[PDB]
């Protein structure tokens, strides 16, 4: 997962 | 079907909280919306349910306390109230890009209780595709469609059975895949023993002075610690 | 599997439009007018403006409007035997548009039973399915008179409720899948409360003015709007 | 499929006509008289004018009238055994038209059961289709006495309501497809409930006035004079 | 299945009345027991039902007003009350032969409602064999056997259906073959909507002063014209 | 087809007869006695005369009587266990007729169930049909005790009423087709309702009078002396 | 087919007998005693005489008596567990008859269910048929306690009434075919209703009198002295 | 299937009584718990039912009045209340060996009504193995499990049928094998069971608390009279005067 | 299928008690939670049920009075309330290792009443695998899921039947394998006659002064001895 | 033709 | 249609 | 076969 | 297919 | 049977 | 044999  | 208490401790060590956006609210909840659990929010109109749902739709993607890395959200909408533009404003407040926020939320409308249960089976399948991706499941609202599809008397047996089945499935989803399940509900809180038992945390929301709101632990003694004051802005729930 | 991202849903909602009521204050009350991807319900007593509003929207839905609204066609299901093209002629005269063109862009059907009404709505769905973007508005005047008619005796209420819920879920799906506004009228005396996205109470004001209000909303001025009725329809 | 344009529907309604009741005030109350493509229901107690109105319309429907109405034939379904051609004789005398012509232009049938009444209405639909513009009025005196007769005990109400709805929907279709006025009489207890209220496009309560005068009112309408009309009953039928 | 109003007028011109034996009763009935119609008489014990039945059994054979030529009678007896000797006494009163009177009355007992309906089907056949011979059908009484055969509730639906079917058959018989139908009934009047609708004329019989009786139009206002006084003698129904 | 002229019916009724009750006043009350082509029902409390009347008719039906009555045989169906030939012996003694002849002209059967009672009545119908005019009296003491017994709980009342109506219509047809008098006794609570009221052509209430006298009255009739009669009970019957 | 002449029936009834109760007044009340070709039912409260009457008849039925009664044997079906031969010993002592002969001439059976009671009555019918004229009295103490037991809840009342009617018609046929007296005891609430009222030819109400005396009355009879009788109870039985 | 009255008299001559441990209670019962019969004891908590059960468990093994020789006992326990240590204390009171007392009592728990009926069928078999060995059958309690297994209405017909069948079996066991049957029962006051249990029991005893530590036994549904009542005491040695 | 009273005495000599952590509570219970029996605890919120469950989860593993050797525990959780960290705190109080405590407790969630019964069948199998290892079965709570799955009336008969079956299985498990069964229950105590009979010991818990709690024997006379005072701490139930 | 009695 | 006259 | 009444005095 | 708005006068 | 003496 | 937890 890549934070926004 | 049995684990040792040691294995269950190892399982619970991965439990996380998703911040509500309000420090006082988080303290009330012990850190925020808790994983491996269902949290139910009920109250009257303009008490904060939709604002809280959207704020959690944003905050669940943000790295947080206790090593929370952020993740994806599933939103089931029985009320036709989901509005991405609120997520845009909240993302602006939290200094994150709109499109990225909108890409990490999967959304579905439910139009009947049978449809809602089928959607929740698809949610289970989606979690099964790859664990650790999703952290939060939102259902706004949890049983409006059960009130809609079985309004006359005499059909209560099947209504209660379907409701219990859905809520046991929700519990199993929350605990097997280590996700927080947040649901909204109406008042008349409805659901009776079934919903009371199924929800691990229940929150009453009401209006305070001016624009403030108050969250309280349902059926708890009249004491300040069981209450929290929060505010609503274009940026969502806050202190 | 039936799921979209919030981004795709945002892209879908960006196509939402409003159809003017003919009254500026009423439009402000509604946030621009009758909204697509939603059901708007109007209820009140006799001569409060339901039929006048239905006919005015029958005309205004064909006109270019704010936000790049290009106009489109209308379907009108009539359970009350109240549709009158001459009202549309007068309103077209007011808005300086040709009568026959206005009348050619409205499709019309009478419903005589609730089962007939649901079949008609299935034909409406098929018609919308034929080509998207052609139709913008579905009017049902009125939404559930036939359900009161066909199941009046006690003991049949369960089936009544089931059929009503089914119809209203279909109407929701129609409104949201085909991006049309659905406007329905209703009488006064959970299913209908839930199904409607916007609910408007209509009542008489001083003289010839009428008042529109958000149902079950606080007693505050912003939730009310004053409008007038003329031979040219709804206006300021 | 199954839909018309508003233009076509306007063209269809342009052929709508009214049949005078014989009373100016009554016609004004009705917007010209008994309207085609619609059901008008008259209910009241005994000697309020239902039968006099039926016979008067049996005569006036054959007369040229306002709006280019050329006159035509009538079908009368009688569940009460009350139709009396002699009244038509007196009414024709009043309106100065020949007796035998009036009597030859009215078709008549008794209905003894609700199933029989529905079969009769199917024959009527076929006859009206046979050649449009000949018949202008269908009278049913009365509309649902036989439905009360055939299902009087409780528990059979579902089938009663279903049959009644079916008959009334068929009557609506007959009136609107074949451009005829449908006039029906009804009893009070008005019976029928929501079904008959919805099916009828116009509902008239008839009651006794001063002396020999009668009163017509729009049912379920506000208590106001405009929604009421005074008329008289004579050997010549309904009049001012 | 339809007639012109002219044809129906021609058919109704053949309607006749059978005198009850009482002038005031006849005035009450518009001339007497009317053909193409059902007349129902109900009351308590010894009010005149059986005397009226027998008197009509005799008077239907006598030439009368309006060119009435007389004719034959059919009598269906569910109560075991028919007594030819009463007819003998009434014939004596009217100075007519006994054996001729007795030869012109056909008689049958009914022991069940199904039997009663079969008998009515035979009656329809007999009337059809040659029209104009029979003028009067008497049923004493109309629905005692339906009370008997369907006394427990739960079978009420079938009772009402059979009763309606029988009464519609009676109506069709009376109107198709131009006969008067006279029936007696008990009180508790029973029948409900079905019997109220089926009967064209309803008569309540009660005791008057001394040995006199009173006949009244049922459900009519309390007014003298709706009532008639008559007397009962060994010679049957007569004037006071 | 199934119809008679009034003349034929008059000829049929000319053969109607009456069986004396043993009491002149009772006979006047009945128009001569127990009438043929009809059912006569007698009901009352205990010791009002029902059993005495049954036995007296059991004897008087065998005797030549008024109106050319020649006498004949009797059938007695007993649901109450009350029939006692010795009463017939005493009544025969009173009327100066032989005991054994009286006893030979009465056929007797007990009924233990309503179905049994109806089967017995079918045999009675067959016997009457074998040769009309032989039997003049059918006694049923009592008419529907066994129907009360076999259908005492509610919910089976419909079947009770249907069976009762069927039996009573059969009784009517038997009485009128074969020109026999049917005499039945009944209890009070009179039971039967509309069915038994309609089925019976004559209904008699029996009650106790002054001293040892009894009173018979026409049921549901006005309160007038002509509708009542006084009679006495002795070892010789009514 | 199924009919007798009145003469044959008279000849059959001439063989009817009465069994003395032990009390002169009771016997007068009954027209001589317990009558054959009939059922006599005795009901009352506790200690009114039902069991004493049963045992006294158990003894008196064996003694030659009035009207040419020759004496005979007795069958006793006991549903209450109340039969005690020692009472018969005391009554035999009173009447100056041998104990062992009395005890040998009474056949005895307990009934534990209504089906058992009916089977026992079928065996009784068989025994009577084995040789007629030997047995003169059948006692059932009590007649329908077991029907109350086996059908106590409503909804099974139809079957209870049907079985009761069948049993009572069988009892009637037994009494009338073999010319025996049938004596039965019954409880009060008398139970059974129309069925038992019709089936019994004689019904006796027993109640307590002054001191140690008892009173027997004809059930449903007018309030008159002739319909009542006073009797006493002693170690020697009914007197 | 029939006996002569003489044979039945000979059979009844074998009836015996088992002392309750209380003289007044025994007088109330005509000597004690009677054979060829069912005796039912019902009452509220701490009225003496369990103490009476255990005392009879001991006294049934002791020679007694009327030529009673003593014998063995069968105990079916639906309440989980049987405690051998009470029998040890009562044996001490009556000066008899503990292990001998415990060896002469056969014991089984019942967990369902069907199980209880199967157990009673085994009891019938055991009695049949050799008659005259066992003198007392105790069921504590008689129909708690029928209340449990059929608590909702609509199954009441089957409950009543099973209960009647069990009680008729108990009667037949008591009368065929000449054993006393003692059962305990709850109250709801009036005892449960209705007509079925009232008829099935030959003797019915209501137990209630008296003054201080005393208890009172009464004949159920009997007139309010002293003779129909008895006072007794409860000690570590069981039921006593 | 029968044992002698001697054999049963020998079997009961193996009965043990598990200390609650409170001396007064233990005295109230005759030593503590008793084996071969079901003990039910019911009360309002924050009365001690969960604290008691966890304390017993720890104390059942410790050697104790009367030669109690300690053993393993099975915990079926219908309320989502089991928290190993409480066991960690109680182990700290009693000076025993955390991981050893956590390894000797087997744990399972139940989501339906049918699931709960299947779990109890697995428990029976596990106990059978090797007897004498497990000493305590905890069910928190006993019939919440039966309330949930049968909330509408008309299905109450089946609910009661399933409940009775489960409780009879629990009794047989406790008595065959000599284990103590401790269950928690809600109030409205619910269950009716079935649960009242099935439980050998019933405890009402209520709040005392300040932070103290009071345990009482249900349906017992109003006397102090039938009551006990105890305290709740991070270390569990205590004095 | 009907024959009237006379 | 012919009007009556 | 005839029944013998008991008698011993 | 494009929608044609009505427009005359 | 031997009494448990 | 069961091993009691002990670290103390």
Numbering used by the authors:
A (entry chain O): 2406 to 2409
B (entry chain B), I (entry chain A): 84 to 271, 287 to 337
C (entry chain C): 83 to 271, 291 to 337
D (entry chain D): 83 to 271, 287 to 337
E (entry chain E): 84 to 271, 287 to 338
F (entry chain F): 83 to 271, 287 to 335
G (entry chain G): 83 to 271, 287 to 336
H (entry chain H): 84 to 271, 285 to 337
The authors write:
BRCA2 is essential for DNA repair by homologous recombination in mitosis and meiosis. It interacts with recombinases RAD51 and DMC1 to facilitate the formation of nucleoprotein filaments on resected DNA ends that catalyse recombination-mediated repair. Whilst Ex14 and Ex27 share an eponymous FxPP motif, their sequences are otherwise divergent, and they demonstrate specificity for DMC1- and RAD51-binding, respectively.
Hence, we established a crystallisation system for the structural core of human DMC1 in which its N-terminal domain was deleted (herein referred to as DMC1 ΔN; amino-acids 83–340). We then soaked DMC1 ΔN crystals with a peptide corresponding to a truncated form of BRCA2’s Ex14 (herein referred to as Ex14-Tr; amino-acids 2401-2414). Whilst soaking substantially reduced crystal quality, we obtained X-ray diffraction data to anisotropic resolution limits of 3.40–5.80 Å, in which additional peptide density was clearly observed. The electron density maps of the bound BRCA2 Ex14 peptide could not be interpreted unambiguously. Nevertheless, we were able to build the BRCA2 Ex14 structure guided by an AlphaFold2 model of the same BRCA2 Ex14 sequence bound to a DMC1 ΔN dimer. This resulted in a refined model of the peptide at seven out of the eight DMC1 protomers, with more extensive structural information at instances away from rather than at crystal lattice contacts. The observed BRCA2 Ex14 peptide contains the PhePP motif (amino-acids 2406-2409), in which F2406 is buried in a hydrophobic pocket and the two consecutive proline residues enable an unusual backbone conformation. The conformation of the Ex14 peptide was the same in all seven copies (r.m.s. deviation <0.4 Å), albeit with variation in the orientation of the F2410 side-chain and the C-terminus.
